[PDB]
């Protein structure tokens, strides 16, 4: 009886950060209340100043990571302000029924809706917008995110022993398809409706123009590099709502990886690289063992270093010369 | 001694349906006899009336699902009628030796052949045509299907307990590469031989023009939507003989998934989406928990909703408001 | 204390062959010493005589397979002769820290360096060149290979029982992006620096012009076909530093497969085809059961048979008619 369950209100935070939560459930099942406001906005996605009409949950690409426990109820108030011009909705891959909630959450500008669903399966899951007839346009305009449904007793390794993270980050990876003129320059439109049919032609080529983390080239670098310390246990949740990706921590590993993101399965150990299929969220657990800069990439290195799918960690601590050392620094023969 | 084994003749059925079989073997090992007639035919693959010279086993794209048990013998009579104009053969991924049988089954028009092989490994497997020098043209002209080799004691979960399906469907997913003129319109040819070299150029671009289930855009929708009831256990076998796919049941999950299709492995649980590599068949088991329409897709949503890789389930039964409910239907603020 | 450990010097061999090693470690942990000389060279990659400025470790594409045991120390002397014109370095995916060693191994022509790292994780791993700002160009010019870190007690099956191979081969699969003129003919440059910017445009299309095993179309065929005998246990290590692949032994299987290459995980059994993500090495174990020619392919059959990703095994021994036989050879009706 759902009336009788506790309610807790969660205030979301902007990726790659994750809202505060408990790994091990400190309460019984709850109705966990979220609100997201849909924002249609111009976003600059690259160093060149290329613009897209982005379609966002809560103003970000990706949408924020929501976190609950298995057999919690997720209750989302989804608001489509009258400053928007499109139809929106939401499909949670975590949910069961009505196209993941998409059939129940179609909101015109000036409308809102509240959906509740029971999070029966533990894992990380994609959520995305999916209005009938215009689904790939919405998703590849950035209107996707993820939800983590933790087991009530937290994550476990392949032996069933607890794995506890110190830090969690959420990397949303976005393929964009910016339409081009016949010379191959990107096009600009006053409104999203004007972009749409050219958007469909660009998507049908299947090759992205850009592939970015956290909504832009370089978003997770510099002052916005991810951070950790030697000895810290870090979970990286990574989603890709539309295309395969192959994440790799350059300088590290995934010590435990749920490549297709579902925590009732034992993790894969010691991964160099893993395949997160388009329409999936995955999670990798790593304990840093060396300080310094790491590149976290889609290991199609073209996608990473030419199209945008690369971020950095800056890791503090002491250097372990037993794990790695320069015996002879680069020098002339 | 094979003479002494029972023979059973199977009459195949058109995908997405599957011929009658027993999950748990009710006999000892058998020689299971199949006949397929090769048909070269014009097929309309999209709503626009785009045509291809399709190359089929038994008149369908995909070819029918064959079902046997482990350590049965598959005996296929493969007929190339004199109304055809090409060389054909068959490679079973389930089989061992002679390029999966391809080296033994090359039939000119007006020829037939009978191949026998022992199905030593349980799983779902691709079969396809593969004539030396022209293999991708044949496969991507639709000449592929799948065979399921069930364990003799039926499917098992990750704990080794029986999993019994009520219903099984076979989704064959086909990438087509229809040649284009310089404006990007699809080309038509009187005969397959006239299409061939332009076919090779179109394939070499690597990007499909169409990606369809059951041989056409919309084939598994409307009167040909897949069906189930709440509480029904359904196995969806999915193959892709040439390219990766990432199936997703929109509104559901794969409760147990053999993404790369081999039943001696424990299934992956609770999948949102899974990666079936090109040249593979996979299988997902799901118990429906909600009525209504589901979209079963390749979750590159461009491939699904622009190129054709989307089908529907229509599911009957009562709606469970505990699993999902609209708290506040879409309404003005 | 590393001074006190044994040192062993390994002399590498050209792929697809693998240097001599012990599967089960016959010594305690060692510093295993390797030397590689970087060679920039013109390579003809196809039957048409298409040329690329290849960037190699030790003169080969791929670079040689290095083999050590877990908790050995790998010590690589990497030499950039003054006959080269580019900056090079090396990222070992097996290693921990400093971008896999890339941050410590940047050598100008006329320089060398020696890196040591502890091989803490067992598996097969990609290594590649990765100079900051030019990483995908180097990798897709062929400057990648793999390292196998065997468990000290050798490989184990899914039950933890020994798996011992008779033969090991290393297939490096290389996506190349040869720039084209406007008619689609490949371009030639006097020097690598002249190719670079056109190389970047070609890579950004994301679709390879060629995809080859062992550095060229047809490299593992004819006199250079891989070989085995019926009853022989063969491990095929396969890497792809930049794009997904889907290996398949046509006529066979992967009896035990580590698709993402990490030996602390149980292998997947009875695979027809497996997904090795770009930036990964994988390994498949197979016991041949039939003689004859096998095609070992990337099972995007376009990539295999049009772009180059196909090799052969020639297998000797007797034919098993119980596993497969022609009942009726192709003949007229
Ligand atoms: Cu939307
Ligand atoms: Cu989805
Ligand atoms: Cu055929
Ligand atoms: Cu095949
Ligand atoms: Cu280099
Ligand atoms: Cu790498």
User: Quick one: residue A187, left, alpha or beta (phi over 0 = left, psi -120 to 50 = alpha)?
Assistant: beta
The distance of C312 to chain B (nearest Cα, Å) reads 11
Is B237 within 8 Å of B65 (Cβ atoms)? Answer: yes
H or E segment to which residue B200 belongs: helix B192-204
H or E segment to which residue A212 belongs: strand A210-213
Asked if B225 reaches chain C (Cβ–Cβ under 8 Å), the answer is no
Q: What DSSP designation does B47 have?
A: T
H or E segment to which residue B193 belongs: helix B192-204
SS3 track for chain C: CHHHCCEEECCCCCCCCCCCCCCCCCCCCCEEEEEEEEEEEEEECCCCCCEEEEEEECCECCCCEEEEECCCEEEEEEEECCCCCCCECCEECCCCCHHHHCCCCCECCCEEEEEEEECCCCEEEEEECCCCCCHHHHHCCCCEEEEEEECCCCEECCCCCEECCCEEEEEEEEEECCCECCCCCECCCCCHHHHHHHHHHHHHCCCCCEEEECCECCCCCHHHCEEEECCCEEEEEEEECCCCECEEEECCCEEEEECCCECCCCCEEEECECCECCCEEEEEEEECCCCEEEEEEECCHHHHHHHCCEEEEEEECCCCCCCEEEEEEEEEC
User: CB within 8 A of A217, min separation 6: which ones?
Assistant: A45, A46, A47, A210, A308
In a domain? residue A211: yes
CA dihedral A150, A153, A154, A159 (to 10 degrees): -120
Task: Give which of C37, C69, C244, C59 is closest to C147, Cα–Cα.
Answer: C69
As a whole number of angstroms, the distance between CA A226 and CA A315 comes to 9
Residue A5: burial class (beta carbons within 10 Å; 0-12, 13-18, 19+): middle
Q: How far, in Å, from the CA of A101 to the mean position of ligand 1? A: 13
Is A284 within 8 Å of A309 (Cβ atoms)? Answer: no
In a domain? residue C331: no
As a whole number of angstroms, the distance between CA C126 and CA B332 comes to 55
- Phi then psi dihedrals of residue B81, to 5 deg: -60, 160
Residue C304: burial class (beta carbons within 10 Å; 0-12, 13-18, 19+): buried
Give the CATH number, domain containing residue B289.
2.60.40.420
As a whole number of angstroms, the distance between CA B178 and CA B216 comes to 13
b/e map A94-105, b = 16+ CB within 10 Å: bbbbbbbbbbbb
Question: Do C18 and C66 belong to one domain?
Answer: yes
As a whole number of angstroms, the distance between CA B234 and CA B290 comes to 13
A143 is in an annotated binding site: yes
User: CB within 8 A of A259, min separation 6: which ones?
Assistant: A268, A271, A274, A275, A276, A282, C260
DSSP one-letter string for B115-145: EEEE--S-EEEEEE---TT-HHHHHTTT-EE
Is C13 within 8 Å of C64 (Cβ atoms)? Answer: yes
Contacts of A319 in chain C (CB under 8 A): 97
B129 is in an annotated binding site: yes
The tally of CA atoms less than 13 A away on the side-chain side of residue A330 is: 17
Which of A136, A151, A166 is a domain's end point?
A151
Contacts of A305 in chain C (CB under 8 A): 135-136
Comparing alpha-carbon positions, the chain B residue that sits nearest to A97 is B251
Give whole-number Cα distances, B52 to B49, B179, C266, in Å. Answer: 10, 10, 44
Mutate one of B47, B273, B312, B332 to test the A interface: name it (highest A CB count within 10 A): B273
As a whole number of angstroms, the distance between CA B139 and CA B62 comes to 10
CA angle in degrees (0–180, nearest 5) for A240-A198-B45: 80
Cα–chain-centroid distance for residue A23?
19
User: Which among A208, A251, A293 is the nearest to C96, CB-wise?
Assistant: A251
Which of A113, A129, A151 is a domain's end point?
A151
Task: Give which of C252, C331, C294, C315 is closest to B115, Cα–Cα.
Answer: C331
Is C10 within 8 Å of C19 (Cβ atoms)? Answer: yes
Question: Do C117 and C180 belong to one domain?
Answer: no
In a domain? residue C162: yes
SS3 A145: strand
b/e map C12-38, b = 16+ CB within 10 Å: bebbbebbebebebeeebbbbbbbbeb
- Phi then psi dihedrals of residue A267, to 5 deg: -70, 155
As a whole number of angstroms, the distance between CA B237 and CA B76 comes to 21
Residue B333: burial class (beta carbons within 10 Å; 0-12, 13-18, 19+): exposed
Give whole-number Cα distances, B93 to B10, B98, B100, B276, C258, in Å. Answer: 20, 11, 6, 15, 19
In a domain? residue B203: yes
Which technique was used to obtain these atomic coordinates?
X-ray
b/e map C250-273, b = 16+ CB within 10 Å: bbbbbbbbbbbbbbebbbbbbbbb
Q: Give the dihedral sign, CA B280/B281/B287/B293.
A: positive
Question: Do C74 and C197 belong to one domain?
Answer: no
As a whole number of angstroms, the distance between CA A69 and CA A123 comes to 9
In a domain? residue A22: yes
CA angle in degrees (0–180, nearest 5) for A262-A264-A268: 70
Contacts of A257 in chain B (CB under 8 A): none
Cα–chain-centroid distance for residue C82?
27
In a domain? residue B274: yes
Judge whether A21 counts as a catalytic residue. no
Q: How far, in Å, from the CA of A173 to the mean position of ligand 2? A: 15
H or E segment to which residue A281 belongs: strand A280-287
For residue A69, list its beta bridge partners.
Answer: A150
- The answer to whether the CB atoms of A77 and B333 lie below 8 A apart is no
Helices and strands (H, E) in chain A, number of each type? 3, 22
Report the greatest alpha carbon distance in chain B: 77
Alpha-helical runs (H) found in chain A: 135-139, 192-204, 301-302
Specify binding-site residues of C. Answer: 88, 93, 128-129, 138, 143, 299
Task: Give which of A178, A204, A201 is closest to A189, Cα–Cα.
Answer: A178
Both tokens of B277, joined, read 């590599």
Is A238 within 8 Å of A327 (Cβ atoms)? Answer: no
Asked if C157 reaches chain A (Cβ–Cβ under 8 Å), the answer is no
Domain range for B269 is: 152-318
The bound ligand whose nearest atom lies closest to the alpha carbon of B129 is 3
Which chains reach chain B with 3 or more Cβ–Cβ distances below 8 angstroms?
Answer: A, C
Question: Do C139 and C161 belong to one domain?
Answer: no
Task: Give which of A227, A324, B110 is closest to A236, Cα–Cα.
Answer: A227
SS3 B100: helix
User: Which among B272, B325, B331 is the nearest to A279, CB-wise?
Assistant: B272
Comparing alpha-carbon positions, the chain A residue that sits nearest to C139 is A301
Is B115 within 8 Å of B76 (Cβ atoms)? Answer: yes
SS3 A138: helix
Q: What DSSP designation does B107 have?
A: B
Contacts of C306 in chain B (CB under 8 A): 136, 200, 203-204
For residue B171, list its beta bridge partners.
Answer: B238
Residues of B involved in catalysis: 88, 91, 93, 128-129, 138, 143, 248, 272-273, 299
Q: Which of residues 233-272 of B touch A (CB under 8 A)?
A: 244, 246, 248, 250-253, 259, 268-272
Asked if B84 reaches chain C (Cβ–Cβ under 8 Å), the answer is no
The distance of B197 to chain C (nearest Cα, Å) reads 12
Which residue's structure tokens are 């080969």?
Answer: C60
Task: Give which of C213, C245, C219, C232 is closest to C168, Cα–Cα.
Answer: C232
Question: Do C138 and C11 belong to one domain?
Answer: yes
- The answer to whether the CB atoms of A324 and C101 lie below 8 A apart is yes
User: CB within 8 A of B68, min separation 6: which ones?
Assistant: B30, B32, B74, B119, B147, B148, B149, B150
Q: What DSSP designation does B60 have?
A: B
Cis peptide before C177, with omega less than 30 degrees from 0? no
As a whole number of angstroms, the distance between CA C148 and CA A22 comes to 39
Which residue's structure tokens are 């399966």?
Answer: A121
Which residue's structure tokens are 């007929």?
Answer: B79
Question: Do C171 and C184 belong to one domain?
Answer: yes
Is C234 within 8 Å of C289 (Cβ atoms)? Answer: no
State the pairing for strand pair A31-44/A73-80.
parallel
Both tokens of C274, joined, read 């497996």
Task: Give which of B105, B107, B87, B108 is closest to B95, Cα–Cα.
Answer: B105
The distance of B199 to chain A (nearest Cα, Å) reads 18
Question: Do C45 and C135 belong to one domain?
Answer: yes
DSSP one-letter string for A30-51: -EEEEEEEEEEEEEE-STT--E
Both tokens of B192, joined, read 């397959």
- The answer to whether the CB atoms of C328 and B262 lie below 8 A apart is no
SS3 track for C52-68: EEEEEECCECCCCEEEE
Which of C118, C151, C184 is a domain's end point?
C151
In a domain? residue B14: yes
As a whole number of angstroms, the distance between CA C40 and CA C248 comes to 31
Question: Do A188 and A310 belong to one domain?
Answer: yes
Number of domains in chain B: 2
Task: Give which of C42, C96, C55, C51 is closest to C74, Cα–Cα.
Answer: C96
As a whole number of angstroms, the distance between CA A120 and CA A69 comes to 9
Residue C280's CB: how many other CB atoms inside 10 A?
31
Question: Do B245 and B298 belong to one domain?
Answer: yes
User: CB within 8 A of B38, min separation 6: which ones?
Assistant: B55, B56, B57, B78, B79, B80, B81, B84, B88, B107, B143
For residue C35, list its beta bridge partners.
Answer: C77
Question: Do C282 and C164 belong to one domain?
Answer: yes
H or E segment to which residue B199 belongs: helix B192-204
Task: Give which of A28, A35, A143, A21 is closest to A91, Cα–Cα.
Answer: A143
Question: Do B137 and B67 belong to one domain?
Answer: yes
- Phi then psi dihedrals of residue A301, to 5 deg: -70, -20
In a domain? residue A26: yes
SS3 A136: helix
Question: Do A158 and A292 belong to one domain?
Answer: yes
User: Which among C117, C278, C280 is the nearest to A323, CB-wise?
Assistant: C117
Cα–chain-centroid distance for residue B105?
21
b/e map C188-207, b = 16+ CB within 10 Å: eeeebeebbebbbebbbbbb
State the pairing for strand pair B247-250/B292-298.
antiparallel
DSSP one-letter string for B282-331: EEEEEE--S-EEEEEEESSHHIIIIIS-EEEEEEES---TTTEEEEEEEE
CA dihedral B92, B93, B99, B103 (to 10 degrees): 0
Task: Give which of A188, A165, A249 is closest to A213, Cα–Cα.
Answer: A249
Contacts of B253 in chain A (CB under 8 A): 96, 121
SS3 B3: helix
Q: How far, in Å, from the CA of C72 to the mean position of ligand 5? A: 25
Q: Which of residues 176-215 of B touch A (CB under 8 A)?
A: 207-208
The bound ligand whose nearest atom lies closest to the alpha carbon of C86 is 5
């Amino acid at each position: 009886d759902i009336s009788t369950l506790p309610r807790v209100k969660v205030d979301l935070v902007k990726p790659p950060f994750v809202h505060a939560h408990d790994q091990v459930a400190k309460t019984g099942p709850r109705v966990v209340e979220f609100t997201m406001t849909i924002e249609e906005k111009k976003l600059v996605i690259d160093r060149e100043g290329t613009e897209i009409h982005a379609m966002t949950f809560n103003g970000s690409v990706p949408g924020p990571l929501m976190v609950v426990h298995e057999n919690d109820y997720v209750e989302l108030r989804l608001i489509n302000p009258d400053t928007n011009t499109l139809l929106h909705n939401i499909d949670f891959h975590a949910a069961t029924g009505a196209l993941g909630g998409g059939a129940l959450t179609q909101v015109n500008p000036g409308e809102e809706t509240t959906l509740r669903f029971k999070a029966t399966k533990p894992g990380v899951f994609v959520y995305h917008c999916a209005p009938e007839g215009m689904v790939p346009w919405h998703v590849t305009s950035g209107m996707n995110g993820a939800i983590m449904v933790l087991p009530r007793d937290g994550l476990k390794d392949e032996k069933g022993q607890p794995l506890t993270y110190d830090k969690i980050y959420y990397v949303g990876e976005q393929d964009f398809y910016v339409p081009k003129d016949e010379a191959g320059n990107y096009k600009k439109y006053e409104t999203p409706g004007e972009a749409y049919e050219d958007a469909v032609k660009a998507m049908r080529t299947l090759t992205p123009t850009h592939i970015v983390f956290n909504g832009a080239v370089g978003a997770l670098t510099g002052d916005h590099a991810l951070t950790a310390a030697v000895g810290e246990r870090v979970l990286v949740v990574h989603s890709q709502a539309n295309r395969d990706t192959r994440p790799h921590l350059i300088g590290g590993h995934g010590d435990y990886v749920w490549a297709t993101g579902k925590f009732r399965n034992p993790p894969d150990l010691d991964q160099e690289t893993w395949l997160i299929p388009g329409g999936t969220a995955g999670a990798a657990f790593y304990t840093f063992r060396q300080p310094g800069v790491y590149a976290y990439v889609n290991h199609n290195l073209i996608e990473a270093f030419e199209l945008g799918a690369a971020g950095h960690f800056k890791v503090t601590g002491e250097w372990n010369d037993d794990l790695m050392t320069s015996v002879v620094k680069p020098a002339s023969m």
